[PDB]
Amino acid sequence: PPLPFTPDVLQLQLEHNVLKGELIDRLRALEYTIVTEQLQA
Amino acid sequence: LIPVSLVDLININIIFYILLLYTLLLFFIPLFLASINYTYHYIYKYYNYNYNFINNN
């Protein structure tokens, strides 16, 4: 196959779903901080 | 000597002086407190939460 190993689809969807929210929640914090930069600018 | 006097010990005129002085002080306290410190600017600029992500792989 293309891969050399057997991925555990449950643990990958777990990390993917957890990491997705951490990225969206990070962008919301950055948009929150950009508001103070486009005010100071 | 003139300032050596018991009349000048409890002089009501100086008491009026003190009264008006400290009433005006009280009136102007909220303007004495109106000095800005730049410490929360420092906290906003320098406080950086850990932005690294978790990666089990």
The reply to whether residue A15 touches residue B51, judged by beta carbons under 8 angstroms, is no
Tell me the domain boundaries of chain B: 1-57
Cβ contacts of B57 on chain A, cutoff 8 Å: 15
For residues B13 and B10, what is the distance between their CA atoms, to the nearest angstrom?
A: 9
Mutate: best of A15, A39, A40, partner B, most B CBs <10 A: A15
Check: CB of residue A15 under 8 Å from CB of residue B56: yes
Do residues B53 and A19 lie in contact, with contact meaning Cβ atoms separated by under 8 Å?
A: yes
In the PDB record, what is the listed experimental method? cryo-EM
Phi–psi pair at B22, nearest 5 degrees: -80, -25
* Cβ-based neighbours of B2, under 8 Å, separated by 6 or more: none
Resolution in Å, one decimal, please: 2.8
